[PDB]
Design a protein around this ligand. Structure first.
Ligand SMILES: [Cl-]
Length: 261
């Protein structure tokens, strides 16, 4: 197909390995490129952690408004929001928003702690039928992205299915689904990634990721006009440990997909 040829050429030009999964909710059809190969998730795993906390909140009503102390020991390598509140508190809702919309790594570790460790995030994934997702480590070491290492990876097919379930399906309660979608739509980190390759009139919510080996990821839910919503995930990783992340490769993959719609 034209999409596959274009994705392979993009992959060659970029020097890396690209994975793409598109789900069209009109007919549940999928377009896949390396759909069943594992890729490091990096910050895309924050969606699962936030969703798991939302799920806890369905029976623990005021959980989202619970204050959590932010301590110096909590800070890691990228803390744009958390560093502003050190020695104060943030609520779990605020931590979820920081994680999702700013990719705050301290905020992620606070969510992981709220869930009882990395295993708590993975247990939620299993509870919503994702047998592929695995979170093995905390921030920042979950970003090592070593080729062939299955730790902290998923597949494009698996993550597209899961994002669909969380944002358009019934993995969460109605109020919680709406809250996750609201957070994703307010993301600040994704302008150069999938968003840059979509028509501006199509609304999207997304979560990016980046890490070692020039790993560059984005997962999005998209509301085009003229048709049912779509889910698009784009995962990218490179052979050299010190390769720079390439948000523009994800934009190009999104353009290729949008061409084939
Ligand atoms: Cl990793």
């Amino acid at each position: 197909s034209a999409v596959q040829q274009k994705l392979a050429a993009l992959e060659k030009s970029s020097g890396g390995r690209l994975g793409v999964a598109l789900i069209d909710t009109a007919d549940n059809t999928q377009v896949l490129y390396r759909g069943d190969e594992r890729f490091p998730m990096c910050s895309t795993s924050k969606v699962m952690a936030a969703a798991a906390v939302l799920k806890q909140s369905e029976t623990q009503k005021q959980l989202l408004n619970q204050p959590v102390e932010i301590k110096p020991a909590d800070l890691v390598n990228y803390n744009p929001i958390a560093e502003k509140h050190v020695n104060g508190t943030m609520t779990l809702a605020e931590l979820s928003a920081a994680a999702l919309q700013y990719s705050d790594n301290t905020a992620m570790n606070k969510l992981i702690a709220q869930l009882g460790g990395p295993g708590g995030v993975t247990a939620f994934a299993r509870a919503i039928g994702d047998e592929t997702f695995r979170l093995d480590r905390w921030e920042p070491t979950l970003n090592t992205a070593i080729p062939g290492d299955p730790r902290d990876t998923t597949t494009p097919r698996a993550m597209a299915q899961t994002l669909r379930q969380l944002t358009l399906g019934h993995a969460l309660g109605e109020t919680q689904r709406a809250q996750l979608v609201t957070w994703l739509k307010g993301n600040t980190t994704g302008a150069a990634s999938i968003r840059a390759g979509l028509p501006t009139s199509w609304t999207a919510g997304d979560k990016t990721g980046s890490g070692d080996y020039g790993t560059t990821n984005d997962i999005a839910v998209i509301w085009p006009q003229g048709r049912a919503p779509l889910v698009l995930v784009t995962y990218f990783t490179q052979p050299q440990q010190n390769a720079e992340s390439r948000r523009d490769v994800l934009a190009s993959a999104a353009r290729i997909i949008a061409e084939g719609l």
